[PDB]
Design a binder for this molecule. Structure first.
Ligand SMILES: CCCCCCCCCCCCCCCCCC(=O)OC[C@H](COP(=O)([O-])OCC(O)COP(=O)([O-])OC[C@@H](COC(=O)CCCCCCCCCCCCCCCCC)OC(=O)CCCCCCCCCCCCCCCCC)OC(=O)CCCCCCCCCCCCCCCCC
Ligand SMILES: CCCCCCCCCCCCCCCCCC(=O)OC[C@H](COP(=O)([O-])OCC[N+](C)(C)C)OC(=O)CCCCCCCCCCCCCCCCC
Ligand SMILES: CCCCCCCCCCCCCCCCCC(=O)OC[C@H](COP(=O)(O)OCCN)OC(=O)CCCCCCCCCCCCCCCCC
Ligand SMILES: CCCCCCCCCCCCCCCCCC(=O)OC[C@H](COP(=O)(O)OCCN)OC(=O)CCCCCCCCCCCCCCCCC
Ligand SMILES: CCCCCCCCCCCCCCCCCC(=O)OC[C@H](COP(=O)(O)OCCN)OC(=O)CCCCCCCCCCCCCCCCC
Ligand SMILES: CCCCCCCCCCCCO[C@@H]1O[C@H](CO)[C@@H](O[C@H]2O[C@H](CO)[C@@H](O)[C@H](O)[C@H]2O)[C@H](O)[C@H]1O
Lengths: 171, 170, 113, 604, 97, 62, 459
């Protein structure tokens, strides 16, 4: 699934981040990040892909030996301290349909504009289905990529749940 | 309030205040504030309620159960006599549970009252607790959930038989 | 670098998997066929998930198949453990009953049971 | 008596009033958190009057105000014990909770469910005061399980996060394992002494107390997170920072130690239990202090500090010094709660960043948090005459001069040295050096709720130990004669730990890259206890049920629904599959009559 | 074959946003809410709890305590044992052998 | 690949790799992000044991 | 007891003569009035039971079961009326009639003095229960669940019929008051071993005893909600109540005959609790939770001590309200998503906040949080089995750990985490559903303030 170039670049990013977790201090990190870059540049032009694969394989074993047992993780990345912290506050938009009319009356302007989005979704749906139908090979899609809208006044197929997803800090 | 003989207390011995400082005791002034702001209004409310109770005075009594023949005097399978004997035994069983509770409450109050000297000063309560527990255990312990006067008697006669045999060998 | 020893609860990292780098062309073909199945199912799901008029649950046959299989078919389960505990408790209670009969178990304040 | 008893109860009743108002809709939601914070502060005031009365004359009493239930010869009353331990602990818990609640008004200001959060904090406190004032084991059990369940709800506050839910259930798992010991002690005391009341337990003073006390030691091991049942306390850092401050200082974790202090009249006569708690505390204090040496999350460092300090309290129990163990509980509550509040200040100012490797250069940018962090670190490390010194210093001397396990004593001194190291590690990486946080600088500690909350705990962290030390009545013969090298051991090894910590920290600046040692990986991954035990044990249990013996095959195959049903189905086809021929039916009549006379003599 | 299609599920809130969930008829829906709340909460739970609280000495627990006090007072005053091992008078018993 | 025929009762249910859901890519756009599952894909027999709240089989540095 | 039997019977003409749209209003209102009057049975004395007549009697054991029985009928009516909305009127009335007739048999079962009268009414409860499951259950398997339920019970009850008739011939009576006075010890012999088994196995299948339990998860998965409520709240307790009474005449043989059933229950409770951790069907999980809880009841009844009989009575009442509440909570989700799979709909606290509080309270009672009557009953059983043998504390302790694990796991999986994206018909909780939940939990938690009324005759 990953190409050789993709695997090399992912190792390079991964090794730098673990190197950064060992060094801590910026001047120390900058110094050793340059040595590491030099090692990658030492074989950038290796044309023999059999040798190149072995270099990649050996670099991965070297990384496994020298990885930080407790590397730095950005707080909201998977495994971070703030990961998924705000999922409890994310409420799907369809819940507003079940509001009592008295609750809806407190935001007359918000719910007026909400009807314009629901109307837009209703009048776009048939085109989106028919566009996907006529752009999909006989044996169904071969990838998960979706197409853009082709005409003016058309919306890209399957847009609602991307466009109206909850905000990252919804409360 | 309660019978002082059933629930005895010793005579309290408080020491008189003997200050050795010029600073005022904050507890003494808080006590005056508590008496004025808390106890006094509370007492007035109670005294009002006590006046109303006096206007309407009525009584309730403690039920007295006549003694009836016990299970030892009941002919085998004579349910009418066994019933009265069995209901009486159950009433006494509930009374003995409360007698042990009274003695346990004496022991617990003594331990708290005597402070760090409780091991020496609570000997009599401890000894009385030990005896009533022994007597209660002999009467009722190991009878099972379906206990009855009949099973209580069977247990006593077993104990009496072991006591007679032990003396016989002595 | 001592080699990685995988276990049941500690699996081999992908970057250390020798099969990860020795991609043939029939392995590429298998990967392309797996993605086709995933994409075909993704489309089927999305055409219902995005439908404005749908209100309910998108029934998933995979989930129904899993629960159906897991609920079928109605040593820790036979007579072994029952026998083992029987001899543990019977032995303990025989010893206790013997002591009580000989008057050698302390029950001085035991009047609750 | 009337003022003392009346004010002891208003304190507890006062705390339940905000709960009443919420659950009956008769309060102002605009500032429920302020209302809850005000109730705590008034409860602290009223609780200081009974405490003053006790300090004056040693006035103690028990209130058995409500007869709840009588089981034959076991009478259960709602019974409150206003004694030495209740009188001293309640004001400390209320004073600290007062700071934590004022701090939470700033820290949780953006939480949509702040009102529920403050209700949970108040319930979490009430269950602790039930635990502390309980006079019988059933009532104590109510508070025991109450703090556990409140911990579950507050650790799993952000319930959309799987790790938060996992940590919340982990706390329940480890604490219910300890609860096996609590129920064991309850069962033993009922069967052998006919009571759950502390008065009768102490009066009967059983000599054969191994079984009940091992049960209590197991309960304390879980609630205080001693070795074997320890991992849940570091994992509890999933909860919001105010939860960690309260969980780690004034409520849950010290309950295990407090349970053993309650029962010192039994443990002081049992050398065997003393030895067990001594060694259990010694391995706990060393092992968790070793783990803190390599942690990078600021909250986990302070979490391991609590475990290490709890182990020291368990060592104090083990050397027959219950009142010194209780003093450390009271002093530790101040600076430990303030260290968590200092860490929350830094985390907030750095956009929820908790890794110390991304801190640095905060000594001047956060002057007040810096001051509180330094004071708290010095108090924790036993700097002379700060609040931590008036307990730890006496504890190390008591252990040095006792008839004691030699290995446990050595492990305790090394852990004291390690305390200086991870305390240095926080200060060095959080406050010193150059900044390592992102470029957009939103550092701001200038909220009055933040400054005032920390300020009160800072004043407590300087003077509380001195004030408490000089007011409590003596209950032991403190040991004051010893060689110079046993008198100053704590101060020396603490100083050595600081000097060594500097060397190690400053070597992180040299342009040398090191491979990890095996000792470093052991410390970083917490001895592999969570990695091995939290995978293996769940795997065994979870595959236990969702899962061959021939003996069982006989009985199962015999009396299955499928086997019985097949038999009748087979018998039915034998009975019913007939040719319909007159000839065969009558021929069977002939056989029937013959065997009736020949085999069975029915003709006779 | 000749089978009716499966009907779509009905949301009671669509026709009646004030629905209590009891019935699709608004007037019946409200009445059914009131009987449940009045007979359930106002009567059974509130009056039933009050009834239970004032039961006259459930299983003579209080009488037994008063009776025990009377016996303890009498037996200590007269120097008798508080309680005896034998429940039944041995003079009324006749052992075998 | 089915489980080996025996008396357990798997039937023809697929035998899938004995891997935790914690090992799946967290950045991919799963239909069930918390479980890291896609609609329609076969669920491991022991999935309820391999959810992210329970048994982890992730590679370890040691 | 006629002051309860007759008004219960009158609920039938009331339902049939009601206006078309007032069948739910009328039957619910009047069955609550009957429930209210059931508190007059609290006139319990310390020595004598309340003996009304030659036929019926109440004591501290049957009284709490009677009040639970009569309180459950109105709750079953609120629980059922939504999923029966499309049923034709006559079939709705027949459904209500089956519930009314079940209450009539139950209140007579718990008050019968004579044991054959108990047997007949104990057996009569089968008919309406079977009809409710097989007629108004949802899926195909309800026909098999009816057959397993019927024949498990009859395989045990028919030997009981022989044993009871045998006992009357020998003793001369089966009146329970007489048996209290005419009871004679059971001597060792093979005849008495089978008399003991014939007297007990019918009640063991009802509890159900571990190893004889597999019918229960089938019945619950297939039954409608009212069927589950009565099954879990009261019908299982017929076995417990029967055993509590009939053990009077099986002494001392119970001393050793209990061992195989104590081992099954002590081990069975750990296995069923662990099974709950891996269940995928929410109704099946709650059914296994019931087997685990009832295992303690069997142990408590078999060891025959005052503390265990008090623990058994309290657990029976506490389990009835808790398990019935859990089924109602599970059903309210089912009426939205039409599936019992526990993993299907997650993160529901985000969408139904108050209903998530009912889940929390129900789970806390299931894991027996002090001072709930669930804990009081469990604690009393744990105390008494410790005296029976100290080692049992380990099995009891492990079960309490596992019980907390699956109780919270059920709460965490359904209420926490991220909501399922594609499920978008999670409408707000109805007043009926919230009232239904609170009519379980409120009486349950109020009983904490006055536990004695559920501790049975040994109190
Ligand atoms: C006369 C007869 C009297 C009849 C009975 C009278 C009492 C009934 C009152 C009913 C009215 C209550 C009301 O209207 O307030 C609703 C009250 C406030 O409404 P809200 O502000 O909108 O909050 C919405 C959520 O429900 C709020 O949910 P939440 O998440 O904020 O928390 C609610 C709470 C549930 O409420 C408390 O249980 O759950 C918990 O906090 C779990 C804590 C577990 C306790 C742990 C400690 C155990 C030790 C116990 C010590 C006992 C002393 C010895 O909400 C509820 O609590 C509803 C459940 C009521 C259960 C009461 C028990
Ligand atoms: C603190 C609040 C004050 C307080 O404690 O109240 C006083 C009492 C407890 O205190 P008390 O026992 O000391 O009584 C106080 C009154 N005097 C002083 C006269 C004794 O509260 C209660 O008794 C409440 C009892 C609730 C139990 C009944 C619930 C209703 C039952 C409805 C039936 C349907 C449900 C199903 C039942 C299942 C089978 C039982
Ligand atoms: C091991 C213990 C574990 C307990 C677990 C149970 C937990 C339940 C939750 C606890 C709730 C707090 C209960 C304590 C508060 C006081 C309750 C009370 O007063 O009960 C009524 C009291 C009963 O008196 P008593 O003889 O002791 O008990 C009878 C036997 N049950 O009657 C009285 O004494 C008379 C009271 C008179 C009040 C006059 C003043 C009222 C002023 C108006 C207030 C509004
Ligand atoms: C009066 C005393 C009479 C004693 C004899 C009683 C038995 C009478 C038989 C009545 C039942 C007739 C039905 C029947 O027996 O089925 C036919 C069966 C032949 O079936 P087959 O497969 O050949 O034998 C298998 C047996 N294991 O034949 C048989 O199995 C027999
Ligand atoms: C001094 C003497 C010391 C005594 C020590 C004896 C006890 C030591 C062993 C305690 C149990 C060890 C297992 C604990 C499992 C646990 O803590 O749950 C956490 C686990 C994963 O959590 P975690 O590793 O933190 O990962 C989070 C990020 N994904 O998440 C889970 O998977 C747990 C949820 C599923 C529950 C699985 C069942 C656990 C069964 C083991 C617990 C004990 C069972 C009863 C036996 C104990 C009593 C003998
Ligand atoms: C302790 C005493 C217990 C007494 C129990 C009461 C007796 C009940 C008698 C039922 C006997 C007949 O029950 C019958 O069993 C077979 C099982 O093979 C079922 O038959 C079913 O299973 C078999 C294989 O298992 C298939 O080949 C068959 O196609 C299928 O219909 C019948 O659908 C069922 O009606």
């Amino acid at each position: 699934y990953l190409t050789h170039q993709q695997k090399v670049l992912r190792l390079y990013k991964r090794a730098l981040r673990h190197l950064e977790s060992w060094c801590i201090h910026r001047d120390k990190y900058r110094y050793f990040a340059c040595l590491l870059r030099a090692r990658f540049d030492e074989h950038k032009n290796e044309k023999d892909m059999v040798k190149a694969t072995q270099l990649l394989r050996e670099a991965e074993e070297e990384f496994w030996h020298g990885q930080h047992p407790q590397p730095y993780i950005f707080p909201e990345s998977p495994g971070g301290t703030s990961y998924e912290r705000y999922e409890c506050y994310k409420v799907p938009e369809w819940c507003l349909d079940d509001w009592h009319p008295s609750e809806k009356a407190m935001y007359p302007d918000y719910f007026a504009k909400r009807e314009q989005w629901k109307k837009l979704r209703r009048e776009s749906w048939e085109r989106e289905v028919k566009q996907l139908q006529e752009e999909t090979p006989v044996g169904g899609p071969r990838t998960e990529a979706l197409p853009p809208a082709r005409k003016q006044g058309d919306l890209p197929p399957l847009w609602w749940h991307i466009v109206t997803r909850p905000r990252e800090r919804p409360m | 309030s309660w019978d002082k003989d059933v629930y005895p207390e010793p005579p309290r011995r408080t020491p008189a205040p003997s200050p050795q400082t010029s600073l005022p005791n904050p507890i003494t002034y808080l006590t005056k504030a508590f008496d004025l702001l808390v106890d006094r209004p509370v007492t007035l409310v109670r005294e009002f309620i006590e006046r109303q109770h006096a206007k309407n005075k009525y009584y309730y009594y403690h039920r007295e159960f006549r003694r009836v023949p016990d299970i030892t005097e009941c002919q085998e399978k004579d349910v009418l006599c066994m019933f009265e004997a069995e209901m009486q035994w159950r009433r006494d069983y509930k009374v003995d549970q409360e007698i042990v509770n009274i003695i346990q409450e004496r022991l617990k109050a003594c331990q708290q009252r005597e402070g760090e000297s409780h091991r020496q000063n609570c000997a009599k309560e401890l000894e009385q607790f030990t005896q009533v527990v022994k007597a209660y255990q002999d009467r009722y312990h190991d009878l099972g959930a379906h206990y009855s006067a009949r099973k209580c008697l069977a247990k006593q006669k077993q104990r009496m038989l072991a006591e007679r045999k032990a003396a016989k060998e002595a | 670098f001592p080699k990685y020893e995988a276990s049941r609860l500690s699996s081999l990292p992908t970057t250390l998997d020798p099969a990860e780098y020795d991609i043939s062309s029939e392995t590429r073909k298998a990967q392309a066929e797996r993605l086709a199945i995933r994409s075909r199912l993704k489309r089927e799901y999305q055409l219902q998930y995005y439908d404005p008029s749908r209100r309910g649950v998108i029934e998933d046959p995979a989930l129904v198949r899993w629960t159906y299989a897991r609920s079928a078919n109605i040593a820790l389960f036979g007579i072994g453990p029952l026998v083992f505990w029987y001899y543990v408790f019977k032995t303990d209670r025989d010893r206790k009953e013997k002591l009580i009969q000989e008057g050698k178990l302390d029950r001085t304040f035991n009047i609750s049971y | 008596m009337n003022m003392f008893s009346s004010l002891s109860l208003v304190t507890l009743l006062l705390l339940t009033m905000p709960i009443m108002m919420m659950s009956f809709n008769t309060y102002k939601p605009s500032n429920y958190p302020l209302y809850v914070k005000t109730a705590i502060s008034y409860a602290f005031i009223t609780s200081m009057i009974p405490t003053m009365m006790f300090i004056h004359s040693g006035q103690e009493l028990i209130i058995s105000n409500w007869h709840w239930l009588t089981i034959q010869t076991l009478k259960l009353s709602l019974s409150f014990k206003m004694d030495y331990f209740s009188m001293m602990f309640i004001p400390v818990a209320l004073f600290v909770t007062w700071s934590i609640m004022e701090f939470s008004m700033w820290y949780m200001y953006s939480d949509p469910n702040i009102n529920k959060f403050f209700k949970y904090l108040l319930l979490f406190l009430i269950t602790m005061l039930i635990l502390v004032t309980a006079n019988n084991l059933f009532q104590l059990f109510i508070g025991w399980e109450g703090v556990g369940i409140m911990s579950f709800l507050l650790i799993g506050w952000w319930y959309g996060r799987a790790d938060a839910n996992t940590a919340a259930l982990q706390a329940i798992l480890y604490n219910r394992i300890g609860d096996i010991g609590f129920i064991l002690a309850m069962a033993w005391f009922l069967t052998n002494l006919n009571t759950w009341d502390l008065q009768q337990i102490f009066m009967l003073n059983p000599s054969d107390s191994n079984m009940p006390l091992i049960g209590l030691a197991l309960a304390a091991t879980g609630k205080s997170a001693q070795f074997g049942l320890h991992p849940w306390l570091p994992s509890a850092m999933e909860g919001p920072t105010p939860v960690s401050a309260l969980l780690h200082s004034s409520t849950m974790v010290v309950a295990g130690i407090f349970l053993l202090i309650r029962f010192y009249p039994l443990t002081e006569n049992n050398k065997y239990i003393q030895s067990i708690t001594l060694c259990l505390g010694a391995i706990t204090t060393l092992f968790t202090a070793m783990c803190a040496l390599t942690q990078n999350d600021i909250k986990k460092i302070i979490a391991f500090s609590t475990s290490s300090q709890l182990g020291l309290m368990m060592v104090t129990i083990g050397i027959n010094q219950p009142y010194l163990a209780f003093l450390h509980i009271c002093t530790h509550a101040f600076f430990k709660a303030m260290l968590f509040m200092c860490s929350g200040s830094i985390i907030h100012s750095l956009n929820d960043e908790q890794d110390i490797r991304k801190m640095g250069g905060l000594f001047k940018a956060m002057p007040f948090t810096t001051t509180a962090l330094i004071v708290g670190s010095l108090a924790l490390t036993g700097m002379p005459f700060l609040t931590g010194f008036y307990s730890k210093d006496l504890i190390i001397e008591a252990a040095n001069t006792s008839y004691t396990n030699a290995w446990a004593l050595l492990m305790t001194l090394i852990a004291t040295s390690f305390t200086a190291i991870y305390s240095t590690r926080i200060i060095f990486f959080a406050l010193l050096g150059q900044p390592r946080f992102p470029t957009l600088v939103n550092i701001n500690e200038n909220n009055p709720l933040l400054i005032n909350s920390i300020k009160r705990l800072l004043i407590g962290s300087l003077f509380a130990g001195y004030i408490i030390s000089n007011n409590i009545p003596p209950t032991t013969i403190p040991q004051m004669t010893m060689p110079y090298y046993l008198k100053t051991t704590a101060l020396i090894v603490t100083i050595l730990g600081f000097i060594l910590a500097l060397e190690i920290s400053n070597m992180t600046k040299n342009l040398k890259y090191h491979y990890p040692s095996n000792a470093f990986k052991f410390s970083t991954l917490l001895g592999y206890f969570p990695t091995i035990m939290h995978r293996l044990a769940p795997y065994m249990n979870l595959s236990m049920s969702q899962k061959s013996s021939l003996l069982d095959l006989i009985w199962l195959e015999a009396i299955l629904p499928k086997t019985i049903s097949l038999a009748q189905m087979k018998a039915s086809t034998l009975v019913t599959n007939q040719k319909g021929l007159i000839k065969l039916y009558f021929l069977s009549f002939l056989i029937t009559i013959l065997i009736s006379m020949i085999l069975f003599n029915f003709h006779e | 074959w000749q089978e009716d299609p499966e009907p779509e599920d009905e949301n009671l809130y669509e026709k009646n946003p004030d629905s209590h969930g009891y019935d699709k008829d608004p007037a019946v829906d409200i009445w059914n809410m009131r009987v449940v709340f009045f007979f359930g909460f106002s009567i059974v739970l509130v009056l039933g709890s009050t009834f239970v609280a004032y039961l006259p000495d459930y299983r003579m627990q209080e009488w037994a305590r008063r009776e025990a006090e009377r016996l303890v007072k009498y037996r200590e005053a007269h120097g008798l044992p508080i309680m005896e091992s034998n429940c039944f008078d041995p003079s009324k018993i006749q052992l075998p052998e | 690949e089915p489980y080996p025929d025996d008396g357990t009762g798997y039937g023809d249910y697929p035998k899938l790799p004995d891997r935790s859901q914690q090992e799946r890519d967290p950045w991919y756009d799963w239909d069930h992000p918390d479980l890291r599952l896609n609609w329609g894909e076969p669920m491991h027999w022991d999935l309820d044991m391999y959810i992210r709240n329970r048994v982890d089989t992730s590679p370890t540095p040691v | 007891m006629l002051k309860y039997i007759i008004p219960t019977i009158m609920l039938m003409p009331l339902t049939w003569l009601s206006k078309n749209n007032m069948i739910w209003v009328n039957s619910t209102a009047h069955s609550l009035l009957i429930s209210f009057t059931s508190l007059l049975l609290m006139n319990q004395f310390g020595d004598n039971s309340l003996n009304f007549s030659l036929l019926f009697f109440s004591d501290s054991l049957s009284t709490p079961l009677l009040i639970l029985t009569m309180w459950l009928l109105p709750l079953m009516l609120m629980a059922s009326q939504h999923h029966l909305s499309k049923e034709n009127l006559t079939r709705k009335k027949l459904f209500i009639t089956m519930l009314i007739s079940l209450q009539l048999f139950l209140i007579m079962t718990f008050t019968a003095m004579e044991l054959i009268l108990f047997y007949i009414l104990f057996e009569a409860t089968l008919v309406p229960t079977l009809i409710i499951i097989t007629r108004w259950g949802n899926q195909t398997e309800r026909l098999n669940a009816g057959l397993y339920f019927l024949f498990y019970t009859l395989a045990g009850s028919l030997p009981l019929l022989v044993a009871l008739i045998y006992i009357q011939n020998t003793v001369g009576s089966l009146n329970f008051l007489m048996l209290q006075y005419w009871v004679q010890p059971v001597h060792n012999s093979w005849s008495n071993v089978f008399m003991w088994l014939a007297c007990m196995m019918a009640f063991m299948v009802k509890m159900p005893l571990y190893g004889l339990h597999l019918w229960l998860p089938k019945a619950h998965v297939e039954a409608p909600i009212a069927g589950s409520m009565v099954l879990a709240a009261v019908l299982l307790k017929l076995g417990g109540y029967g055993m509590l009474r009939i053990t009077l005449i099986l002494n001392p043989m119970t001393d050793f005959m209990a061992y195989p059933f104590i081992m099954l229950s002590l081990w069975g409770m750990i296995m069923t609790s662990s099974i709950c951790l891996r269940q995928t069907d929410l109704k099946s999980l709650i059914a296994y939770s019931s087997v685990s809880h009832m295992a303690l009841v069997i142990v408590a009844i078999l060891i025959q001590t005052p503390w265990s009989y008090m623990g058994a009575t309290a657990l029976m009442i506490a389990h009835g309200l808790t398990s019935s509440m859990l089924f109602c909570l599970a059903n309210s989700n089912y009426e939205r998503i039409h599936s019992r799979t526990m993993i299907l709909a997650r993160g529901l606290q985000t969408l139904l906040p108050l209903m998530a509080t009912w889940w929390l309270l129900a789970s806390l009672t299931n894991l027996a949080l002090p001072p709930t009557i669930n804990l009081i009953g469990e604690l009393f059983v744990v105390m008494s089995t410790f005296s029976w043998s100290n080692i049992t504390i380990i099995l009891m302790g492990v079960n309490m750990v596992i019980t907390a694990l699956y109780s919270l796991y059920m709460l965490i999986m359904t209420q926490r985490g991220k909501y399922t994206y594609h499920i978008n018909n999670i409408s707000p909780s109805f007043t009926r559903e919230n009232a239904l939940m609170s009519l379980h939990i409120l009486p349950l938690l109020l009983l904490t303030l006055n536990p004695k009324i559920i501790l049975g005759p040994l109190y």
